[PDB]
Ligand SMILES: Cc1nc2ccccc2c(-c2ccc3c4c(ccnc24)CCO3)c1[C@H](OC(C)(C)C)C(=O)O
């Protein structure tokens with residue numbers, strides 16, 4: 220999607236832990252956190268953080284049941300977020316890409332969470348020809364003036 | 366400072382917990398996390414996250430001993446961050462402002478960390494006449510083209 224307020228949120232499992240990954244659909248920019256286990260409360264907390272940093276309008280997921288909890292609904296209500304009911308998705312390979320980079324760097328760090336943030340850094344800085352990190356700020360900045 | 370790669374990191378204490386606050390000096394934009402206690406490892410981890418998201422060149426603090434740990438030095442080395450040896454600071458009132466907003470919203474949430482992220486959201490979205498959230502993306506976007 221071209222729309223700059225659209226994010227996708229999904230969890231992946233690795234080493235008995237959970238990685239919550241948010242992808243800015245228009246740019247391919249990622250933010251991630253390692254959490255103990257998938258819970259509504261953790262998703263809610265993550266969304267509050269994301270919304271305070273970026274202009275989040277709509278969120279999508281590959282697992283709709285992710286957003287059924289009261290806590291998630293509360294966070295979306297307060298921050299003014301809707302569920303995205305478009306996207307009938309390059310975000311699959313985006314997540315597998317991340318899991319690849321994590322694999323490449325994993326032995327360099329003790330903790331998974333360290334490897335994850337290393338992988339997010341690599342992903343967001345990598346040039347394509349701008350990086351995801353540059354594309355997100357450009358898209359959002361532009362949209363402010365539009 | 367006008368320089369867009371400059372951040373200030375400090376911890377504040379509230380309810381027996383620690384709030385790590387990063388301020389983008391040029392814009393006044395904030396990111397924050399609640400941690401159990403001040404440790405080098407938590408500061409290091411926080412820096413890795415910050416660096417993966419923004420083009421962080423130099424970091425300053427009001428407590429220099431914050432950055433003596435091996436873990437912090439490792440994170441700064443890997444992410445290519447230097448200590449800022451300028452700034453001989455509106456960032457004091459910036460932190461007290463945040464603690465004020467937290468006070469205003471605190472009773473609305475069970476957890477301190479929820480109130481903190483609520484306060485970060487409010488701070489970053491508030492118009493001055495742009496918000497901190499808009500100023501950071503503008504400053505960074507502009508600097509990409511310069
Ligand atoms: C524990 C809880 N339990 C809950 C139980 C039911 C519904 C919401 C929560 C909420 C809640 C969720 C999202 C919000 C809230 C806000 C104010 C108060 N509570 C919440 C504004 C920002 O978004 C919460 C909050 O905790 C988490 C964010 C970790 C889930 C809270 O600290 O009150």
Ligand SMILES: Cc1nc2ccccc2c(-c2ccc3c4c(ccnc24)CCO3)c1[C@H](OC(C)(C)C)C(=O)O
Pocket residue numbers: 327328329330331333334337405406407409410413435436437439440441443444
């Ligand atoms: C536990 C530790 N213990 C340490 C002890 C001494 C020095 C560094 C650490 C480091 C370390 C710190 C920063 C880094 C690292 C990198 C690779 C490997 N280790 C680290 C690249 C990114 O920045 C770390 C890392 O853990 C924290 C980030 C929670 C401190 C790690 O998981 O290896």
